[PDB]
Amino acid sequence: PNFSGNWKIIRSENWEELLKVLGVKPAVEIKQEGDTFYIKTSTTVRTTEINFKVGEEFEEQTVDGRPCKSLVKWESENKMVCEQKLLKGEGPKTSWTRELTNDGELILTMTADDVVCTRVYVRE
């Protein structure tokens, strides 16, 4: 399945704790063509865009905001996983996953050391 769409958030669990264990309502637009992705995430006041291909390193930021090199792999046909490494600093191990349900929900998880936050999106 293909992750393209305009995605609205419907659930969120542990965002502040991801935030509270770390230092410190986004809409998401995805275009996927094969293994190539564009993901734009925005709130009312902030926006960011990433471009990556599965299996190719790229640069982005950690939950707490620090510069990182990322690499995405497929865990299955419906789920991708991303390992991150800070470009400069020491820190918690951070990563994220995105997967699609058969019903077309997009589930994001974000992990910072042992704390996991889950966000769920549907297409609008």
Ligand code: NA
């Ligand atoms: Na903190």
Ligand code: NA
């Ligand atoms: Na970030």
Ligand code: NA
């Ligand atoms: Na952040």
Ligand code: NA
């Ligand atoms: Na980290």
